Swiss-Prot record:
Complex and partners: Homodimer. Identified in NR3C1/GCR steroid receptor-chaperone complexes formed at least by NR3C1, HSP90AA1 and a variety of proteins containing TPR repeats such as FKBP4, FKBP5, PPID, PPP5C or STIP1. Forms a complex containing HSP90AA1, TSC1 and TSC2; TSC1 is required to recruit TCS2 to the complex. The closed form interacts (via the middle domain and TPR repeat-binding motif) with co-chaperone TSC1 (via C-terminus). Interacts with TOM34. Interacts with TERT; the interaction, together with PTGES3, is required for correct assembly and stabilization of the TERT holoenzyme complex.
Impact after mutating residue 82 to D: Abolishes ATPase activity
Native source organism of the sequence: Homo sapiens (Human)
Primary role: Molecular chaperone that promotes the maturation, structural maintenance and proper regulation of specific target proteins involved for instance in cell cycle control and signal transduction. Undergoes a functional cycle that is linked to its ATPase activity which is essential for its chaperone activity. This cycle probably induces conformational changes in the client proteins, thereby causing their activation. Interacts dynamically with various co-chaperones that modulate its substrate recognition, ATPase cycle and chaperone function. (Microbial infection) Seems to interfere with N.meningitidis NadA-mediated invasion of human cells. Decreasing HSP90 levels increases adhesion and entry of E.coli expressing NadA into human Chang cells; increasing its levels leads to decreased adhesion and invasion.
Full-length numbering of the shown residues: 16 to 224 of 732
Domain remark from Swiss-Prot or TrEMBL: The TPR repeat-binding motif mediates interaction with TPR repeat-containing proteins like the co-chaperone STUB1.
Identification of the protein by name: Heat shock protein HSP 90-alpha
Post-translational modification: ISGylated.
């Protein structure tokens, strides 16, 4: 059973700005997703301090970057807190309505697209490089779900039929044809060093056969 939802007006407006605005500095999408992963990892780490059983779904707190040139996908995986179905539907746990309003006002006052993460809506920067985004998530309190959107004002949510993940979030970026540089090992290493050099969790960049 696949449920189809309309994005709230503000989110459709934010996604349209990301997709339609001429802005060459697209590489910042990666630090925004890594920042989201780091925040999710902090959340499960903090909860686990008072309830160690919260890590029964996996003790390792890490971030993996997985390029796949055959499928033209770049996947960001973390073993963070994950999201319940309700939080996935509610703009992937973000304050997207108020954050978009504040971000739009900031853009009128001299801010630029790279500041998106400052407003709590950095996830949507995925649309700088992806024509489609699939988010697989598993929270300790809910089942595994797959969220997906190619923008156009709608997203879908279904229970995930894929392999059980334990706990956390996988963001699968189905890259635009002209954005394949983000599948290159040297390019990913360069961006991680430039924008995400010192973070609280290990980042492993997978290589390809
Ligand atoms: C902190 C909520 S879990 C989460 N949410 C997003 C938007 N991304 C990631 N990695 N994890
Ligand atoms: Mg922060």
């Amino acid at each position: 059973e696949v449920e189809t939802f309309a994005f709230q007006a503000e989110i459709a407006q934010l996604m349209s700005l990301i997709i339609n605005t001429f802005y060459s500095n697209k590489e910042i999408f990666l630090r925004e997703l890594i920042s989201n992963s780091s925040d999710a990892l902090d959340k499960i780490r903090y909860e686990s301090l008072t309830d160690p059983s919260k890590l029964d779904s996996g003790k390792e707190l890490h971030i993996n970057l997985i390029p796949n040139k055959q499928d033209r996908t770049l996947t960001i995986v973390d073993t963070g807190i994950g999201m319940t179905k309700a939080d996935l539907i509610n703009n992937l746990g973000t304050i997207a309505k108020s954050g978009t309003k504040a971000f739009m006002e900031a853009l009128q006052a001299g801010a630029d697209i790279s500041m998106i993460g400052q407003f709590g809506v950095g996830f949507y920067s995925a649309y700088l490089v992806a024509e489609k985004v699939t988010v697989i998530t598993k929270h300790n309190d809910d089942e595994q779900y797959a969220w997906e959107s190619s923008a156009g004002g709608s997203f879908t949510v279904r229970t995930d039929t894929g392999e059980p993940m334990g706990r956390g979030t996988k963001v699968i970026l189905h890259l635009k044809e002209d954005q394949t540089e983000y599948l290159e090992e040297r390019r990913i290493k360069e961006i991680v060093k430039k924008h995400s050099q010192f973070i609280g969790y290990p980042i492993t960049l997978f290589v390809e056969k």
